[PDB]
Design a protein around this ligand. Structure first.
Ligand code: 5DU
Ligand code: LCP
Ligand code: ZN
Ligand code: ZN
Lengths: 259, 258
């Protein structure tokens, strides 16, 4: 298929080919903090990341994707709401066409300029990321907000590659990536059961959305909007915006890691 | 000079370093019913580059793995810590017998050995030397060792020991994946304390992990084959190098977990 974020193929149209778009556990969501409850049963979060696990960065047409060697438990997410070990697989980013909004999750009506997703899968139960994405307990995703602020030096390894991956399908070697340092200092989070935010919109994600944003400067953010959603030899169109709006909770409750 | 033998060992260290009898000395008894769970403590944020290790030596008091601490390739953040603490050195404490070799003791349980991973506050101080004399200067991660399966990462250290038998001997050592050596759970206790060797400076934020890592008996025993004496001196073996627990003196020990 040819879903994307343009007029005819964008979010409002995804239900034409992916009716789970109007499902009961869709993401992203709005977090109403007055209705969130602290859950003391959550375990400490554990983030063990190895910079050598990163392999390549590519333009998927819908974002950049940093892909990690995942046949190995060198980079794993454990604890918090999770049972077992979730292997790091992917990092990508969502933004809007201007700085004032662009994040996917929205907390008490506040948008941010962008939102990073860190995708992991349950290799204690499932044989592959692809399989795990079809199971309710299969995926765990960290959401990190990016607010306009002074430039963030931890985005340089990414931003330095963008010209090399301007067209859809381009890739480049990308290793020795310090993902850990791209996370904010506080890992306090909200957690809820939801979905991929792109087709196929599978309801397989335990979301772990960090409260504290990181910074990005407008000049850094603008470079992402210079990526294309089209391949070499196809009429050029820019990936100026790639975020899905929040979907209704439909009865789900959001839990907080913090009082 | 100070050591761990009868005339120069821990009970005599105060005779040359009077802070041995200070109010924030380490190690301690960790009594779990007395520890305070603190929800403000953060999970450890750990980044260790395997290329940072450069040299292993025999100090006469332990082995020491020295890391290149020129810049922030290998840092510890989070936990109880404000700011970034740069990796400097790793060393080990053990005893003459496998069931009593750690420094920290948990509800009376000694472990077979204890690894110390030493870091310094480069966000506030320009060097390890300046950080080592200030109460927020150092962060040390303590990791217990229990007897079990040979540890393939510790085998890399044990393989070097014949080459550093004498005090002052050094040999090149790198590609040490310290992050992978750590146990599965990074839950910890923390308290303010000190170096556990002279000069016993009270500059250490201690972070003691609850879950041990394993080592075989035979691997552990090889560390007792190091000498506390230099080439040309009468040989004496480092069969034990752990300091006894010190009075808590009203410090609060906190837990990251409950
Ligand atoms: N950079 S170093 O090799 O010197 C050193 C380290 F790297 C350390 F990690 C430590 S921690 C104590 C356990 O070995 C030092 F004490 C020292 N020793 C220093 C610490 C300050 C001091 C005072 C008097 C004698 C020696 C020392
Ligand atoms: O439990 Cl205390 O030994 O510090 O009184
Ligand atoms: Zn996403
Ligand atoms: Zn020590």
């Amino acid at each position: 298929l040819s879903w994307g974020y343009r007029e005819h193929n964008g979010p409002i149209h995804w239900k034409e080919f992916f009716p789970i778009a109007d499902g009961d556990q869709q993401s992203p969501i709005e977090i109403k903090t007055k209705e969130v409850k602290y859950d003391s049963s959550l375990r400490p979060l554990s983030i063990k990341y190895d910079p050598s696990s990163a392999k390549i960065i590519s333009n998927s047409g819908h974002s950049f994707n940093v892909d990690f060697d995942d046949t190995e438990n060198k980079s794993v997410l454990r604890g918090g709401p999770l049972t077992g070990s979730y292997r790091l697989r992917q990092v990508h980013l969502h933004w809007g066409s201007a700085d004032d909004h662009g994040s996917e999750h929205i907390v008490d009506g506040v948008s941010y300029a962008a939102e990073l997703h860190v995708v992991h899968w349950n290799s204690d139960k499932y044989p592959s990321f692809v399989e795990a994405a079809h199971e309710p307990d299969g995926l765990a995703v960290l959401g990190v907000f990016l607010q306009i602020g002074e430039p963030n030096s931890q985005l340089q390894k990414i931003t330095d590659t963008l010209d090399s991956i301007k067209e859809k399908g381009k890739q480049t070697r990308f290793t020795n990536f310090d993902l850990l340092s791209l996370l904010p200092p506080s890992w306090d989070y909200w957690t809820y059961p939801g979905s991929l935010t792109v087709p196929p919109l599978l309801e397989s994600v335990t979301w772990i959305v960090l409260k504290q944003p990181i910074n990005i400067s407008s000049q850094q953010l603008a470079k992402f909007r210079s990526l294309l959603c089209t391949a070499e030899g196809e009429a050029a169109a820019f990936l100026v915006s790639n975020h899905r709006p929040p979907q209704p909770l439909k009865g789900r409750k959001v839990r907080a890691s913090f009082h």
